[PDB]
């Protein structure tokens, strides 16, 4: 170690004995304290380190490396923090330690040491026009492994080595927070690298991500009979299957059936299990006029066509093969499929399977967007690159007896299947639990990227494999919330404070305070509610402002 003062500009610049011999530091710079902005809390004086691990050339001829950026405050609380990724990764964030939940404060603003990665590929460099753009890292077997698990492992090791050198000691505790692809990363770490992090938050976790494109092919083919018009490739316009007003009508019928099943009519379906048992859009009534939601004759603004009802029922049921065997899971009916704030309709559910209505092209993530592209090049083995203009047609032609098997296959130099390197389905968390690890899962009920019911099923399997699982892992479902944020629900919350309390003081979260980022969905200026540990739900105490968390408690469903 250099004979310089610890936690100083001198110790920072001297960083330019890494666990990986192929670690290259490109930046080691002292940063003055930065003021708060409209979108970020103030950042303390810190050392910023950025670089890359394992620079190489892939079998596709493209360059690959695992980029990292690390920030270590001069005034340090002894804690290490890694933020998770999003989408197909490929970008390197500011690495101030995002905590999600719509929060403005970063972990660095709370004096954590913070680190981020791009996952082993770079969207500016690994952009191959013959392999569907920024998903093209899937052409290289090692880049897939880096994306699945190896990049986060290498970056955790490098960050902890820099921390030990810069501060003269290891972190007292290590924390990981991620949502979406970052939630998958958190679950992966608990299963594959249980000693890396003491506390993990995994929001809307894509722990079976290679199956998402199977669902996407299914919802695309399910909605196609309800489409009106064709795109430039002659493929039905899935975005035209439901107008925004049509989706709002569906959400209002769900509320009519399900809102009060928790005891309180408030625009929120807290009793999601009772809703799934009760709601059927083919039999549900339109609560406003008592007429059936499904049109008895021609289409009006107050009913849904039988073709629409058949289509959305089939999409929500989930994909099956020719024998009727489920290939993913089903989806929960919930009011956050729509939502109206002023004159603005909620787009956060429909953008995934349908796309924007006001378009002459398909733009749903699951039809022609990045999710369909990622399945073809990243999760199917061998990869299936093709023109971008053929993706929607490929989803339309998807064969549920043949194509779903490709996420379990190996081929040539692809020696692991995508479920092998990307899936995180293990319930063997004994090592994580026994060393004191704590995990908070959360998931929005109206998430159209990954099914909240599928996360619930993992949590049930976890409890069955390990009695007393609530002592170290708890799941917080969020009614009305879309993917990681948004929707008619209480989608904003501070996950880091209860995580630290659980890890360091043994205080399990019996509830987590949340508030709505768009309270106009309920016609109010603010709404706060408790998030409740599965299988509990929020229960109104019977009197007082229904928009105040103090008038609610967590309880078993009625
Ligand atoms: Ca309710």
Numbering used by the authors: 40 to 55, 62 to 603
From the study:
PETase cleaves BHET to MHET and EG, and the soluble MHET product is further hydrolyzed by MHETase to produce TPA and EG.
Of note, they pointed out the importance of Phe415 for substrate binding via an “induced fit” mechanism and highlighted Arg411 with respect to hydrogen bonding of the MHET carboxylate group, both of which are proposed to be drivers of substrate specificity. When Phe415 is in the open position, the side chain of Gln410 pivots toward the active site to a position wherein the heavy atoms would be as close as 1.8 Å to those of Phe415 if it were in the closed conformation. A similar Ca2+ binding site was characterized for Aspergillus oryzae FaeB (AoFaeB), wherein it was hypothesized to have a role in stabilizing the lid domain.
